[PDB]
Design a protein around this nucleic acid. Structure first.
Ligand SMILES: Nc1ncnc2c1ncn2[C@@H]1O[C@H](COP(=O)(O)OP(=O)(O)OP(=O)(O)O)[C@@H](O)[C@H]1O
Ligand SMILES: [Mg+2]
Ligand SMILES: [Mg+2]
Ligand SMILES: [Zn+2]
Length: 344
DNA sequence: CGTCTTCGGCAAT
DNA sequence: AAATTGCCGAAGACGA
């Protein structure tokens, strides 16, 4: 019901007064931590990269969770793939970060220790409190707003071989745009699989795609070309959020995150490259495409990382089969009854 | 649809 | 020498 879905999206609209107060609190704390980190020899070339739903304009309910990425431009990087995970690597150099070296590989553990320590020493100074390595630190500002701070290495090199067949946007955002996007740097965040591994990150490309998302260059720039891509992502994020809360006493949905929904959404955009396939009048049909695709990923236990096709976010090593069947069962029930979790 | 606010980039310090 | 910063304009809440 497109009429009901529009009512849900109004409920999910952020308060501009809340945005102004929340952004002010986040920026003040983030700018403070950047100034301190820029004073350290190791974090000398640190820079800010705003990531996540808020800066992608797909945050729902309230601006209570922010995601920032503190990126270091590292030089002469040499990646070594860990096992055959296609997404986790060991970092080597072909310098400031010499202190974090353990042998010849860059220690994500050591680098995370100084990162957390410098931030923790600076957070006790401030009405903010600090709480698998990525995000490095989670701040709670005034008991209302949480900010995930992710340490990240910036490599301006060509993307690793595992991403060769990823970012399949040629028939959607154009091969010209895929060439320019893959020219931008890629990022490595400390994530353990072994605690000295780094995981590939493309949150900057995800933000850029979401804010320049149409086949048409003028998509969502005027009233005539308002698509419902972001509305469908919001509805999918809310559906998973309401289900995880409804079944929080059970532990099945604890492994599911909004990134699974966001990754699945990018795949639906590849499957439906035209803006006419995302017309505002067809919000219920477009949302059902996102639901139908997400059910297919659950049932087949296959949800490829949008940038690393061989990395399966729904792998059996990552999520239990009973968790996928449970979420499959609940989504099918929810769809067959006009999504009761939206009313709550 | 005009107004106001925030965010992102990068010449110019 | 290279990190900082002010500013322009899009995105989107908001109302009338
Ligand atoms: N498993 C993952 N693999 C790769 N990148 C991830 C993963 N989880 C999160 N990210 C990156 O971190 C960012 C923030 O993720 P987070 O878990 O905070 O949710 P989100 O995308 O911000 O949406 P919301 O916070 O509203 O649920 C994402 O935009 C994504 O780019
Ligand atoms: Mg977020
Ligand atoms: Mg997070
Ligand atoms: Zn659009």
């Amino acid at each position: 019901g497109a009429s009901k879905l529009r009512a849900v999206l109004e409920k999910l609209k952020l308060s501009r007064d809340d945005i102004s107060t929340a952004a002010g609190m986040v920026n003040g704390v983030v700018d403070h931590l950047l100034r301190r980190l820029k004073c350290d020899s190791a974090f000398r070339g640190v820079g800010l990269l705003n990531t996540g739903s808020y800066y992608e304009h797909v945050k729902i309910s309230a601006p209570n969770e922010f995601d920032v990425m503190f990126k270091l431009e590292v030089p002469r990087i040499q990646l070594e793939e860990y096992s055959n995970t296609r997404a986790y690597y060991f970092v080597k150099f072909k310098n400031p970060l010499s202190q974090f070296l353990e042998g010849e590989i860059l220690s994500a553990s050591k680098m995370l220790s100084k990162f957390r320590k410098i931030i923790k020493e600076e957070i006790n100074d401030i009405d903010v409190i600090m709480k698998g390595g990525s995000p490095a630190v989670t701040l709670l500002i005034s008991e209302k707003i949480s900010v995930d701070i992710t340490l990240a290495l910036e490599s301006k090199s060509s993307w690793p071989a595992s991403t060769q067949e990823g970012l399949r946007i040629q028939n959607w955002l154009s091969a010209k745009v895929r060439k320019q996007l893959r020219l931008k740097p890629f990022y490595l965040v400390p994530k353990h699989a072994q605690e000295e591994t780094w995981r590939l990150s493309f949150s900057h490309i995800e933000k850029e795609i979401l804010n320049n998302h149409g086949k048409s260059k003028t998509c969502c720039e005027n009233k005539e070309e308002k698509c419902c891509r972001k509305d469908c992502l919001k509805l999918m994020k809310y559906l998973l959020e309401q289900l995880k809360e409804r079944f929080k006493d059970k532990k099945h949905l604890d492994k599911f995150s909004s990134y699974h929904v966001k990754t699945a959404f990018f795949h639906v955009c590849t499957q439906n490259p035209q803006d006419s396939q995302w017309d505002r009048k067809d919000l219920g049909l477009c949302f059902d495409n996102c639901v139908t695709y997400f059910l297919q990923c659950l049932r087949t236990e296959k949800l490829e990382n949008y940038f690393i096709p061989e990395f399966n976010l729904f792998s059996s090593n990552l999520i239990d089969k009973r968790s996928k069947e449970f979420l499959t069962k609940q989504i099918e029930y929810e769809r067959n009854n006009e999504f009761p979790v939206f009313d709550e």
